[PDB]
A paper describes a structure:
The 1.75 Å resolution structure of the G. haemolysans M26 IgA1 protease trypsin-like domain is presented. To gain insight into the structure and potential functional role of this domain, we solved the crystal structure of GhTrp and demonstrated that the domain does indeed possess a trypsin-like protease fold. This fold, however, contains many unique changes in the well characterized surface loops that are known to contribute to trypsin-like protease specificity. As expected, the GhTrp crystal structure depicts two molecules in the asymmetric unit, related to each other along the c axis by a tNCS vector of approximately half the c-axis length. Despite having low sequence identity (<20%) to most known chymotrypsin-like and trypsin-like proteases, DALI analysis demonstrates that the fold of GhTrp is consistent with other members of the S1 family of glutamyl endopeptidases, as categorized by the MEROPS database. Loop 1, which contains the serine nucleophile (Ser167) and the oxyanion-hole residues (amides of Ser167/Gly165), is similar in structure between GhTrp and BGP but is truncated when compared with bovine trypsin. Taken together, these data suggest that the GhTrp structure could represent a pro-enzyme-like form of the putative zymogen in which some activation event is required to properly stabilize loop 2 in an active conformation to generate a viable S1 pocket. We hypothesize that this putative pro-enzyme form must undergo a specific cleavage event to generate an N-terminal segment that interacts with loop 2 to stabilize a more open and active conformation of the S1 pocket.
Author numbering: -1, 684 to 893
């Protein structure tokens, strides 16, 4: 499992369509089943005009998205394949910036494991975070947790140095190489991510066990 985190780390390409015009962006995701990706909701949605709900970037019926792994393999998906943890309350905080993508059953990729049991991450813990800042592969090796934020019971944001734009959606890994969280912010307003709660882990597994 030495190379399992790296080889599960996918680049995301997003093509947001509006009318007959398209704008593109990039992000990151992690394979946690042969045909299931973990990522952030904000690769796909943003705040509604009044911040009351999450809302698709571009036209959801026209958008196209793509994943690519380090070995060069790639595949496509659409909005029909995206499962948001909570699109309605997405604007309320990073606790809801969470999404799972179910790819076709013909996708049979090697993947990392979602952690079986929740383990609280503490300040001064060292994490391993993978992603594609500016679309380029990057591994934040043993980056230290400096600040924690309790979003809800057993639901913590953590801050660690290293993230830049494009890395959001990349995986946070424990020392065994299991997925425990995901990177969410690499902008100038503090790099960090979300450590998945027992509830969020169960929800992801419910999506996996549909596949």
């Amino acid at each position: 499992s030495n190379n399992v985190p790296k080889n599960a780390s996918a680049l995301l390409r997003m093509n947001f369509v509006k009318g007959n015009q398209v704008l593109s962006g990039t992000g990151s995701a992690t394979f946690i089943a042969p045909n299931v990706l973990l990522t952030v909701a904000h690769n796909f949605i943003n705040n509604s005009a009044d911040n009351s709900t999450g809302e698709f970037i571009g036209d959801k019926s026209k958008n196209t998205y793509e994943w690519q792994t380090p070995d060069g393999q790639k595949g496509s998906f659409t909005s029909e394949d995206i499962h948001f943890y909570n699109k309605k309350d997405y604007p309320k905080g990073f606790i809801y910036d969470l999404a799972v993508i179910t790819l076709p059953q013909s996708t049979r990729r090697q993947h990392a494991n979602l952690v079986e049991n929740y383990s609280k991450v503490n300040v001064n813990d060292k994490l391993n975070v993978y992603g594609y800042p500016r679309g380029e592969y990057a591994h934040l090796k043993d980056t230290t947790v400096e600040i924690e934020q309790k979003y809800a019971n057993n639901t913590y944001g953590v801050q660690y140095q290293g993230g830049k734009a494009g890395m959001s959606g990349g995986g946070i890994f424990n020392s065994k190489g299991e997925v425990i969280g995901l990177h969410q912010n690499g902008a100038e307003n503090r790099s960090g991510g979300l450590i998945l709660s027992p509830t969020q882990l169960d929800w992801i597994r419910s999506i996996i066990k549909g596949k």
